[PDB]
């Protein structure tokens, strides 16, 4: 639905059968989740931002329910402080910015 | 107005009399701009994210026009890869998320 931004935009997500809290982030190209165990094969790949680069594992065709809406895409797993839902997934659930 | 997220949400901003490109980021609590010169006094303060922490300078009561909408608030200046418009300012222009 609609979400103001006075507080961190946190939502409930279901992935790999577990429930977690994730941040809807328009400033992230990709989706990166904390340490957890996922399906098939993966590859290295690195992501950057404020400070330095961190190593992540890339998983494709991963199902994920955000705030109750179905979606399938690429998910990254590495040493991140928080769960980040990027634009790759924010598009599937038709998430847009408005002002 | 409305903005999809298939591409990085970039907008035109006017601050300190100069024109710059900035990213509207719902995943950022604060607003951090690249190296530039601003008004009054400032203080250290540090911000974190993916990788490591970076040093920034804090400036308050700074005017800033985003996509053409007026706003005044705190702006950070440091070694950042991009210009980031955080929730402190995204609220003033009434920016919300929708899906
Ligand atoms: C969580 C990350 C995936 C996120 N980073 C990204 O979306 C960045 C651009 N992408 C990123 O690391 O992926 C692409 C890339 C990979 C290798 C070499 C060069 C570029 C991040 O820290 N994002 C923040 C700030 C930001 C934005 C643009 C550039 C740097 C930092 C908040 O939105
Ligand atoms: C551009 C930054 C201001 C941005 N960081 C933030 O908004 C973070 C939580 N805040 C941050 O550094 O400020 C608060 C703080 C200060 C000192 C000690 C502990 C916490 C960032 O890298 N944001 C990305 C990822 C992210 C989100 C939450 C936590 C870590 C990384 C993209 O949204």
* Burial track B10-26 (b if 16+ CB lie within 10 A, e otherwise): ebebebeeeeeebbbbb
Host H or E run for residue B95: none
CA distances from A60 to A55, A92, B51, B64 (A): 17, 15, 23, 40
Q: CA A80, CA A20: separation in Å to the nearest integer?
A: 14
Query: Is A28:A84 a contact under the CB 8 Å cutoff?
Result: yes
Number of folded domains that form chain B: 1
Mutate to test the pocket of ligand 1, among B27, B34, B50, B56 (most ligand atoms within 8 A of CB): B50
**How far is Cα of residue A57 from the mean position of the Cα atoms in its chain?**
13
| Chain A residues with beta carbon closer than 8 angstroms to that of B24 | 26-27, 97
d(CA A62, CA B64): 40
Coil, strand or helix: which one is A59? Answer: strand
Q: Radius of gyration over alpha carbons of chain A, in Å?
A: 13
Look up the domain containing B39 and give its range.
1-99
Across chain A, the runs of DSSP E, i.e. the strands, are 2-3, 10-15, 18-24, 32-33, 46-47, 54-55, 57-63, 65-66, 72-77, 84-85, 96-98
Residues paired with A59 in a beta bridge: A75
Would residue A25 show up in a list of annotated catalytic residues for this protein? yes
Distance from the CA of A41 to the center of ligand 2, in angstroms? Answer: 30
**H/E segment holding residue A87:** helix A87-90
Contact A66, A93 (CB under 8 A): yes
Would you say the CB of residue B24 lies under 6 angstroms from ligand 2? no
SS3 A46: strand
Resolution (A): 2.5
Q: Phi and psi (nearest 5°) for A91?
A: -80, -40
| Terminal-residue alpha carbon distance, chain B | 15
B45 touches B54 (CB < 8 A): no
The Cα-based distances of A33 to A25, B69, B89 in angstroms read 12, 34, 26
Helix (H, G, I), strand (E, B) or coil at A66: strand
CB B30 within 8 A of CB B54: no
> For the domain that residue B40 is a member of, what is the CATH number?
2.40.70.10
């Amino acid at each position: 639905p609609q979400i103001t931004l006075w507080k961190r935009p946190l939502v409930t997500i279901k992935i790999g059968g577990q429930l977690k809290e994730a941040l809807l982030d328009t400033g992230a190209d990709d989706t990166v989740l904390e340490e957890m165990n996922l399906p098939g094969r993966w590859k290295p790949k690195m992501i950057g931002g404020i400070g330095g680069f961190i190593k992540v594992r890339q998983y494709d065709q991963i199902l994920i329910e955000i705030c109750g809406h179905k979606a399938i895409g690429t998910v990254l797993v590495g040493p991140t402080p928080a769960n980040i839902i990027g634009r790759n997934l924010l598009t599937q659930i038709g998430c847009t910015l408005n002002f």
